[PDB]
Structure formats: structure tokens, C-alpha cells
Design a protein around this ligand. Sequence first.
Ligand SMILES: [Mg+2]
Ligand SMILES: [Mg+2]
Ligand SMILES: [Mg+2]
Ligand SMILES: [Mg+2]
Ligand SMILES: [Mg+2]
Ligand SMILES: [Mg+2]
Ligand SMILES: [Mg+2]
Ligand SMILES: [Mg+2]
Ligand SMILES: [Mg+2]
Ligand SMILES: [Mg+2]
Ligand SMILES: [Mg+2]
Ligand SMILES: [Mg+2]
Ligand SMILES: [Mg+2]
Ligand SMILES: [Mg+2]
Ligand SMILES: [Mg+2]
Ligand SMILES: [Mg+2]
Ligand SMILES: [Mg+2]
Ligand SMILES: [Mg+2]
Ligand SMILES: [Mg+2]
Ligand SMILES: [Mg+2]
Ligand SMILES: [Zn+2]
Lengths: 207, 122, 114, 54, 119
Amino acid sequence: TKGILGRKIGMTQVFAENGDLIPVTVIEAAPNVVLQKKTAENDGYEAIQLGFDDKREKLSNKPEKGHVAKAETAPKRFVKELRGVEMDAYEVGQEVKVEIFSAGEIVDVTGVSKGKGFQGAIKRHGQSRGPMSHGSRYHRRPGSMGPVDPNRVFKGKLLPGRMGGEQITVQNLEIVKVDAERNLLLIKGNVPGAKKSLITVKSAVKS
Amino acid sequence: MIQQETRLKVADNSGAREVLTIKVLGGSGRKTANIGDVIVCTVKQATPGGVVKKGEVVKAVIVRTKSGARRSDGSYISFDENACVIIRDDKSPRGTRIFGPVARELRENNFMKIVSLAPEVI
Amino acid sequence: QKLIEDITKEQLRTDLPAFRPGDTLRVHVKVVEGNRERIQIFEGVVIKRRGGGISETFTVRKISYGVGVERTFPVHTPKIAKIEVVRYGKVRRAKLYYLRELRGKAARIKEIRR
Amino acid sequence: AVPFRRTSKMKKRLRRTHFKLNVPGMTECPSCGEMKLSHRVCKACGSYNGKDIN
Amino acid sequence: SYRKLGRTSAQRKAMLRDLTTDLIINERIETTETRAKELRSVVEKMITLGKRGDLHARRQAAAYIRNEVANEENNQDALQKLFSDIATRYEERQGGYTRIMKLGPRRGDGAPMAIIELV
RNA sequence: UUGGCACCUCGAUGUCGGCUCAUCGCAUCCUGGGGCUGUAGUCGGUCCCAAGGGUUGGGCUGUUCGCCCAUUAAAGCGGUACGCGAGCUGGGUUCAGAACGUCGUGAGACAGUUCGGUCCCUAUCCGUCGCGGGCGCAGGAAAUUUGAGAGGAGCUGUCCUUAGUACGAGAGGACCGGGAUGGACGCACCGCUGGUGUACCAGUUGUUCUGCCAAGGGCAUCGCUGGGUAGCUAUGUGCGGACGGGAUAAGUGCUGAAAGCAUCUAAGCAUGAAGCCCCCCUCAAGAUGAGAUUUCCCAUUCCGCAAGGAAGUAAGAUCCCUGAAAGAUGAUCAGGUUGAUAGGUCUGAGGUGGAAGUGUGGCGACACAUGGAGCUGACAGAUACUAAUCGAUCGAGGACUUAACC
Ligand SMILES: [Mg+2]
Ligand SMILES: [Mg+2]
Ligand SMILES: [Mg+2]
Ligand SMILES: [Mg+2]
Ligand SMILES: [Mg+2]
Ligand SMILES: [Mg+2]
Ligand SMILES: [Mg+2]
Ligand SMILES: [Mg+2]
Ligand SMILES: [Mg+2]
Ligand SMILES: [Mg+2]
Ligand SMILES: [Mg+2]
Ligand SMILES: [Mg+2]
Ligand SMILES: [Mg+2]
Ligand SMILES: [Mg+2]
Ligand SMILES: [Mg+2]
Ligand SMILES: [Mg+2]
Ligand SMILES: [Mg+2]
Ligand SMILES: [Mg+2]
Ligand SMILES: [Mg+2]
Ligand SMILES: [Mg+2]
Ligand SMILES: [Zn+2]
């Protein structure tokens, strides 16, 4: 497979030459750099680390600087791992650039959703409300709690709590256009995550 | 956004004037039906003549809706009244005339006869 | 923002005469029945011109056989041949929503050229 | 609802391990020599960030 | 966004207008922390209006500032003081006309107080 | 289910229907795989395996029941105090009022009918959903990870071809295999259509203030009406349940004796389902069995016979301060003067819709020009003008025993 890391920018439209409006997300990136090649004996598996979006030095400590020194580059900000991939197209210090995705491709997108804080049941799980009339005194509440016999509550009753803010994967999106100048990617549809956040793009696995 | 209990006014010389929606054909839930669909409906007001009598159960297609369809090229279209045309159990209409324009998502479907009988298609 | 700005503006269209809401104009749309490309002529009153950038749309409204019809487009679509302009009109709002009612009923509700 | 059983001393004392205060953030106004608190005006010296503030 | 200060919209606006005129008059007032933190972003806009200095901006400011007497022996009104004196003083400084200094907490309710003043 | 007994509860275990939320069994309603048929085909009938998922909107009655209308692939049967009232409702049910029918001489009565009729509780403990602090894991730290194990998801229609072919006098009309396109359900998101948008823009009534005109402020639900940025949103948009592998159930078998034959089996070898275990998505080393990899810091000073203890520090982190992609509070994330973290200023985006002043025309209300003007909360960029000052605290010196190599 193959994948890169990037940043979310925003959404807009483009016109296919057929003359069809298409919602488009704009994910930019910079040349990612391999940092470490996890072999099959030192580590019980096979993968590569990817760095991205270097930071100014005053924010980097000595351990991280030493870690990066093997690749001879500036200390990056995000460092992720990419597992299923051939391990001879890559050597530490190599650059990975956006041009590895032709148009009309099919890829997978992985991010982290945007938070919503403490949330009730009606919104967190999409339940129903009681009638708001006819003498009722019940609406926006999590319903009953179970039968009497167990003398307890089964593990699995859904209740209010902190909502959103976790990893999410969307599948089978199509690359629309690629710009090697601004280092951009244009994707049909829309991906999770708030603006100015990390975004992972990998080749489709369901294939 | 026609749904159960919505009232519509027919757009043909069948004899009925307005009609009431009973059920939306399709899957099991089918909360609603937009333009270019078929419903089952009962007549509420009819002209003294006409081939249809007041208080029956008939099938009809949807030709115009206030909320309107959305085409693939980003364009939209809308009307300002909900209309329908009675169906003779198959895409053939029952009346002979058609009043007011009809949408264009009918030709994409198999309603050739209607879209031919229309004064103008949009 | 500037990135979105230019990478979109590449596709912009630079032949449309300026026009404010509240003025009739003809539109030449390319409808295709799979074989040829008729050119439907649809003219009416500009009810609303909304949004900016490549997303800017507008709305035209007209009456035909008693019933009124609305129709919107994105201003930069290639589905449009050209846009004439029939008559300017003087108005005060920027959203002529009130026209949705005062159409028939002998209500001569029109505009006046500037 | 109602307390079904009284609470022992053990539980009462265990619950209160997190009910305490925090020593404030103190510093030294290097104009008078007393203990102001950070990012605030030394009400003793009446001075802050070198100069004075009437 | 912007704070609400636990008051109805109208009450909030009124309190803000009053604090503004009072600061223009005294040039150093003293109040709670968040209140001043909110107030500065209005005082600066008023000072900008004054720096522009024409009939239009003057009427705009008058539609916001109260009618108090700044220096009574001269019978100068707060608005005139603002325009003439302040505009003449902060003639060239590009924004950032105020400053905030934090005191300890109050006694009756432990609220943290602070001092706001013109630069 | 209708019953029988009277073992617990009368110093209180509150009924029937409906709402919200579900979960389990399988004697299966649909979808999956089969045997037989009085199965030509398309429909079927009956029996075997199978509980993964799915299983509706109204009319009439307080109603469960029941009948009816219209759809669907299907409109399953049961348990969980005839599930669930410290979660809701109170329609019927059984208090006090009144009336009718019948019985009683009478007060009254009826499991006859009808109208009206007070529903209390701030969550101590276990339990369920979320979020923190301490310590551990034989030195002290920063990152990236494997995955024992746990959860999620699992539905299905119509149409076109193969083909009017097989089959059938005819009527009618396929399996298998391809390809489009829906229903319901779920996840994410605000570019589009719309909603909201109480410190945005405009119009307008009454009254009262800024001495007066002109221009403005206050109050009247935000005074009312027309629009609307950012955020948050669905009815809006995008995508998903695909393709498969291994072992099986019912079934179908191959070879083959016991028993010269026969035989699916005893020894041997296969095939075989929406089930089972993987493939997909998420959590996950407090997995005390406390894992792995990469990088940084070093092995000070005092005491202490000794054992060990104490103090300054390294790498690093926190207190405090500016905040929001975060948020009930902690927490997380971006920054702290070699800096754009926030505010202001300048320039824009969008929103509203032609400011004031002056001039011209009109007797006047008003119109026109100066001029897409004026104004502008949250959005973009640049800009150190103001504020993140000075400081303080925490934080290693690496136990023994074996075997390798030395
Ligand atoms: Mg409901
Ligand atoms: Mg138990
Ligand atoms: Mg103590
Ligand atoms: Mg008010
Ligand atoms: Mg008791
Ligand atoms: Mg069974
Ligand atoms: Mg019950
Ligand atoms: Mg029982
Ligand atoms: Mg209960
Ligand atoms: Mg009585
Ligand atoms: Mg009588
Ligand atoms: Mg008698
Ligand atoms: Mg009653
Ligand atoms: Mg409660
Ligand atoms: Mg408690
Ligand atoms: Mg937007
Ligand atoms: Mg006046
Ligand atoms: Mg008053
Ligand atoms: Mg409004
Ligand atoms: Mg921001
Ligand atoms: Zn001091």
C-alpha cells in the first residue's frame, strides 16, 4: 500500500468536464520523511514511520532531536506509523511526496472527530422524546433501565456522557485532482475532523 | 415532501379536483415521497361529470411539488403548489389534457405519455 | 483561504454581465436529451443572488400557465450559453421574497426601470 | 432517596482526602522584599514590573 | 465570541457604556478582572473613532457616549475631551491604547480585581 | 391459560392499557441450505438444519382481545413481578356528589349503565455511562508500537439481460450467472438547499430625554417587520454493510469389510448454509503475566562502622500567565518576548443595501447627485502597539543469584 499525512483546510466545489458539481475537501501536505524502518526481527512486524510538518527548535527536546538525527532533517511535529507496505521502496531520509496518487484513485481517510462535550441521550444516541403535552412530565430522558429480576443494570445501557472526539475512518473516497505545486489533494466528499487537524490518507484496503 | 395525509390538486381533465394521500408506495417505511413517484390516494372533490367519482381509491403520480428536485449539475427547481396526475394502473394517464407545466424527472422515468402530453416541460 | 481562492478561481467564468436582484433577464441553458442540445430560453425576475466565490448562485422566477416556477443555478456553471439582460429595476431589498404571493389576484406587482 | 445506613468514620475520612487547599503561587517583589503572588501587583511596594503603580 | 457577565443584553450594553465614559473621564478606574478584559475592546474602538475626527465619526460616538461633565471648571463635556485631548495625545500609536494590571482578590466575595488605564 | 393448596408479605410487596428503553428462549413469520411429493414450469404441501439480522401506518372501542382500510420479503409465538409508575401518563379501575333500571316497607344495595373526582421523595451503598488524582511495573525521561482480550457491524426490494430459451396442446413461464437502481438503518460533515443566529444591517408606531431644527439615545416580549456572518444543525451532501478463507450442521457422496452379497463407516477420503472462527471498524500491557523498539541523561555531595539515610542538581516537567481545533471542573491541544497565543490597527471575504453633510427639483410629504456609499460579532492575512514580567518547586546515582562471554 501507500499513504501520507496532511492537514485539513476546508471544503469547496469543482466542475467536472462533464459539467457536474462536486463537493471537494482540500487536504494539503508537505513532503513527508521516513524516519525509521521497523524490520521483522527487532520488531515482530513490518512498518515505517512518517514525519510531517517540522516545528521550530525551541519546542523540541534532546531525545527527539537525537531520534531524528539519523534521518538528517528538522524535528517533525507528528510522527505516525504505516504498516502494510513493501519495504524496499524506502530508506531512512527518503521523501514521500503527494504525487504518488494519480487522479481517479480510491483511498481511505482516517482522522479524529470534533468534540461536542457532555451530551444527553437524545443527541448522543438518537433516541426519542416523550410527548410534550397531554399532561406528560417526560421528555429528553434515557428511558427505563431494564427488568426487575436481575437486580442490576446490564452492561450496555446507553447513558449521557462526553460525546465525540475519537478516531474515525471513512472508506472508498475518490481522488479528484492533484497539485504538485501547492502540494494539495482534492477528494470527493468530506472527511472527519475540524479544520487545521491531522489527516491520514491510505490506499483502499477493500480491494 | 409529500407524505401521508397531504392534500394535492390534480392537473388533468379526469374529473377530480383535489385528492388526499393515503399511502406512499415503495419500501416498508417510506415516510415521504418527492417528485416523480407514485402514491395511492382518495378523491375528495370532483366535478359533476368526469370519469372519476367522489370517494374512490386510485393511483397517481406526482408532477409538481413545492419543495423541488435537485439535478446532478447543481441546478435546482421548485414550484408553488403540489399537483398530481391519476394513473390508469400503468404509466398511461387516465384523462386527456394536462394543465400547467410538469417537471423533467419524468422523462428519465418511464412516463413518456405524460411528458408528451404536457404543455411545456421544465 | 487564499489557496482555496486561487485553485478555484482557475475555473471562473468571465463573460457574465453584472446584475443586481430585481431585473428580468434571459438565460440560455444547454439541455441535452442524449442526442442533441436544445437551448431552452428561460427568463424571469432575479429573486436572490447569494454567496460568494465559486459558490455564488442566483435565482430566477417566472409564471407559466397560472403556476409560478423557480429555478436556480451556480453562476459559473458551463451549462449556460449566455445571459442577456432585459430590463433593470429599482428595488430596496436584497431578497425579493415577498413576490411569492403578490403575483396574480389582479395584483399588478411589477418593477420600474432605474 | 435516603441514606440506607449510617456512614462509618473510615469512609468519612477517606472521602475527604481531596477536600483541601493549595499553597498559593508566591514570589518576591524585587523592590521591597515581600511575597507578592505571580503576575500581580505587590500591594506592599505598590510596584510591579520595575515601575510603580499608584 | 464574547462574555455575557451574567446580565441581560440591555443591562450589559448599559453597563458597558457607563464604564466607557467613566474611563474616558478619570483615565484610571478599577474594577473586576473579566469586566475590564471585556471593556478594553470597546474603549479602543471609541478612541479610533476619535482619531478619525470628522462630523460623521463625532455623531457616531455621541450616539454611544453618555453626557457627563469631564472638567467642570472648564465646563468641558466628556465627548469634547475625548476628541480634542485624546485624539491629540494618541496621535501616532497604532492601536493598543489601554493596559491592564491585576490585583489580588476582593474580600466580600473573593472576586479578583484589576486596574485598567490609558497608556 | 382456567383451576387446586394457603408455605412468605396486612408496624403497606401500589392494578389494567399506552409511552421511553430493551434483553433472552426457539416449538421459525421473512431471508439461507436440504429430503419427499398426488413436485411438468411459475406457484406450492409437509418434514429436517438454522436465533445473524429484520419483523407497519391508520379507522372503531379505556381497552388487551377483535373487526376493517392500505401496504410489505415478513407484518412470529413466548419469558423477564401477565418486564419497566423513587422513569412518565391515569383513560378503565374501587372513597366522599348526583341520576336512571332492578331489588328492599326502610336506612340502603347491584361483578348494571352514566357525568365529575389531590399521583409525595435533594441518591447513602451496589449497579450503569463518562472524566480525573495516587502508586505500581528493581535507575530517571520523551515518542512510536505488538495485541492476550472486549465491543461494533451482519437486513433487503425492483428493473434489464441470459431468454420468451428450458418446460409446457395451450395457457403460461424458469434454475444457475451477470448488471444497474431503491427502501430502512448507521457514521461523518457544512461546499450546496434550508433552520436558528438577543453586542450585524435596514424600515416603522407611541412616548420621553440630548436647550431648538436636523441628527440620535431609553422603554414598550429583541417594541414590531424584512434580511443575515461565524458556530450548532437535517429534511442537505458523502460513504457503509463488498470480495473472500478455514472448520462444520441437515444433506449428498467415493472406496470398503464386519456378513463371499449388499452397505456413507467400522478403518480411510470428499463436498456441503444469512450460522462458527477470520477478513472490515473501534478500544485495549493495572495483560501485577505490568510486553517491544528508537533516542536523551549520567553515575555527584554529605552523613551513616555497616545497613542505609539526607541535600543540592542532569535530561525533563509543573506552578503562574494568553487562549481554543478542547471543555461542567480537572483534563487535552496551541503559545509565554529569537514571538503572531490573544486583543487592537491596516488590508480583505461575506452580510446589509445607497450613510451624514451639501447641492438641485418640488408649495409639501419627498425625489435626484455627490457614491455599490456607509456600517459591520465570531471568518483570512500582515502587523510586537497592549498583555503573556521577574521567579519558584519537583525531578536519577541504578538489589541480589545463577549461566553465558569477558
Ligand atoms: Mg415519536
Ligand atoms: Mg445477584
Ligand atoms: Mg488530614
Ligand atoms: Mg428591551
Ligand atoms: Mg415494614
Ligand atoms: Mg429447531
Ligand atoms: Mg405488568
Ligand atoms: Mg409467573
Ligand atoms: Mg420501579
Ligand atoms: Mg353519596
Ligand atoms: Mg323511574
Ligand atoms: Mg318499591
Ligand atoms: Mg369516569
Ligand atoms: Mg432524580
Ligand atoms: Mg454517592
Ligand atoms: Mg459557511
Ligand atoms: Mg427632530
Ligand atoms: Mg425613562
Ligand atoms: Mg428579526
Ligand atoms: Mg482562530
Ligand atoms: Zn513590592
